């Protein structure tokens, strides 16, 4: 049933992106996140995201859909072990996404718990 | 050129809705807002919105598009006077919107400035 928590956490990641409100990333991202093989602080990862969003220089009403970032039909959630879920989804290239160095068509996100209460994004690739 | 501020402010209203993060409504809504002929406090209007969103009991990945709330092709912005803009848009009925008493197909929003710096939503109908 933790599947619903992961979907909620992925949903919150997605909602933060589409709304360009990065304060919503603060309860989703682990204290250290593996970004393409390199650990980053939560705050340095979140600031990478806000800074790239600003480079897109998008029209205020552009990219206000989850369908602009992801193919939600492709979304897959799989328990990896007691404390780890793998989330896979096919992601889209847009004026915002091209500015994310870590952004790939075929995405892998690991959500991990260190307390069995909270599931945080601890790896993206 | 205040047209771009109104579009930004409407965009922020839209982003708060789609992301279901009502904290984003706090810099958009005037201290008193005329909701269908009756003045409401900002906090009572925002809490109406959060409470209705919770009644929809929507799937976490449902209604993550501006196209689920509004027809953005219909959006119109018009200066009414020195301190007032009328924003008109055709709005959609969904499991979330049916729980908003003030929600209408044909929407009128007034953005007003009391300082010439900040344009706030002061009426919705």
From TrEMBL, chains A, B:
<protein>
    <submittedName>
        <fullName>Uncharacterized protein</fullName>
    </submittedName>
</protein>
